[PDB]
Amino acid sequence: YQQITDVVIARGLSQRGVPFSWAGGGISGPTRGTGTGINTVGFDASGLIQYAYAGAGLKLPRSSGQMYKVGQKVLPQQARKGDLIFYGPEGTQSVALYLGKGQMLEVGDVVQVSPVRTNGMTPYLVRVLGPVQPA
């Protein structure tokens, strides 16, 4: 799983600088969005995560809240690169890819690496790949 996790991360990192686009992107890569993204080839947060994790042969649900609901919950002190970070109650605002060492891959105005922010962060990360640690 270290190897597969590295593939997922490399896929995410390859999209650095791609613009935000509302409802944009998915497992084909960045795409035209809808609404204000209708003429912008890019990603929203969900789209980027779907693209990255397709490298592991996985097809994640689109909404961040659904990704959170179904995912294996991990406490922050147990985080590993490749885990998903969420924002909002029950992860309903956004999602980002944890890179390790206090860094995450997110979609701001563009896809970008940023330090993890705990403001608004959902209390658990999700581990997608793979007893496990108690919640």
Q: Based on DSSP, count helices (H) and strands (E) in the chain, helices before strands.
A: 3, 8
CA gap 97, 113 in Å, rounded: 9
Number of domains in the chain: 1
In which domain, by residue range, is 33 found?
1-135
95: tokens are 């999602």
Q: Which of 124, 8, 25 is nearest to 70 (CA)?
A: 124
Q: Which residue has the tokens 């084909």?
A: 28
Domain harbouring 61, CATH code = 3.90.1720.10
Header resolution in angstroms: 1.2
Answer yes or no: are the C-beta atoms of 97 and 125 closer than 8 Å. no
CA distances from 126 to 8, 17, 38, 86, 135 (A): 15, 25, 31, 8, 11
Instruction: Report residue 91: phi and psi, to 5°.
Output: 70, 20
